[PDB]
């Protein structure tokens, strides 16, 4: 009857923002009391749904996401603003039900020098759509004179070397972010607790 609610939070390694991994949740029990009282989740601010009392409520087709961002863009992942992360990497819809619970992960995701395992997408000619995974890494063209596979002038790669440094500020440390998108439907629910 139990299901891996801990696997999505305590996973081995999360994916990047440009390749965020989506996971379907089915046949679970809503034991969110032990999640809110974990004393490790820094930002539990949930928009639309109260942080507590989630156990006396259960949805139909809840999903899950996983990515890592910087501390300054922790506020960027929200249906209230955009510009750098919710504009090319991963944007949440305006009618999103859930939250972006995240914690400081500056203990196993950073190393001396440059951590090039995680990356993010740079500026693009087009705007990102809600719930879109842009796996393609085509060379961005900033206008005329198409390079067509060459780097240099106005043809920088969309992915950028992140460079997770061990010593950083409060807004420059790694932060593992998980998104619990509640899909409110009318079908008989499958993930419902006590």
């Amino acid at each position, epitope marked *: 009857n139990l299901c891996p609610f801990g696997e999505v939070f305590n996973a081995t390694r999360f994916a990047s923002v440009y390749a965020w991994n989506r996971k379907r949740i089915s046949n679970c029990v809503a034991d969110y009391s032990v999640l809110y009282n974990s004393a490790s989740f820094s930002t539990f601010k949930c928009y639309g749904v109260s942080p507590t009392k989630l156990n006396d409520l259960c949805f139909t087709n809840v999903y899950a996401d996983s990515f890592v961002i910087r501390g300054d863009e922790v506020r960027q992942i929200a249906p209230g603003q955009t510009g750098k992360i919710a504009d090319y990497n991963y944007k949440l819809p305006d009618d999103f039900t859930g939250c972006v619970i995240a914690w400081n992960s*500056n203990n*196993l995701d950073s*190393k*001396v020098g440059g951590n090039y395992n995680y990356l993010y997408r740079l500026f693009r000619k087009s705007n990102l759509k809600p719930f879109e995974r842009d796996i393609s890494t085509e060379i961005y063209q900033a206008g005329s004179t198409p390079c067509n596979g060459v780097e240099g002038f106005n043809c920088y790669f969309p992915l950028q070397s992140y460079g997770f440094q061990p*010593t950083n*500020g409060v807004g420059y440390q790694p932060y593992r972010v998980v998104v619990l998108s509640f899909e409110l439907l009318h079908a008989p629910a499958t993930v419902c607790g006590p």
Partner: antibody
Amino acid sequence: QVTLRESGPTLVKPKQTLTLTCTFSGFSLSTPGGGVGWIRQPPGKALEWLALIYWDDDKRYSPSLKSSLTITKDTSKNQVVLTMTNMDPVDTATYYCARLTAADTIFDCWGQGTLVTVSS
Amino acid sequence: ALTQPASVSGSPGLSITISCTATSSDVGAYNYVSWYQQHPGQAPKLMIYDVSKRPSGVSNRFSGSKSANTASLTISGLQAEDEADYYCSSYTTTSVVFGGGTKLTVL
């Protein structure tokens, strides 16, 4: 538990290639944020980190010894091989290989360390 | 590289503190720092891994603090353990520094 012990040659001639290893046990290498290091200390001096390896085979070296110090890994036999050339008399020191459990905890477990001298 | 005093002394039963500053700009914010009570003869050992948090098992009263860029090692009235040295190590921008050696001689 986590135990580190060095094994290999001790005496070496100048202008050679030293191969120092240390067999680890009691823990895994593919753990998130895990890795082993290598630190030396001349008699009567402080410590200086030479190089280390990570879970994703990331060979980070020292800026002064970037070319010589090359570190490898072998998860099948739980062995770590350190290759470095140009044996100099200033390199005469004891070499401890450490264990980096996480990025927060700096070198939790250490090893016994062997006194590798560089002379004639 | 980090700078710390040459050799701090003190009488038994009293309280002492070893300092460790960050004159060099290698550290970005001096977030992670750790000390090593290197018992002279066999190998160093960890006594405090974080700035203030100490590892389990080998810990009685050791602690530490840091205000802006200078670390510290606050010892209790216990000075009769041995003639142990201490090394402050932290992450730099490109390497792993260890500072110098401070022979903590007790009277």
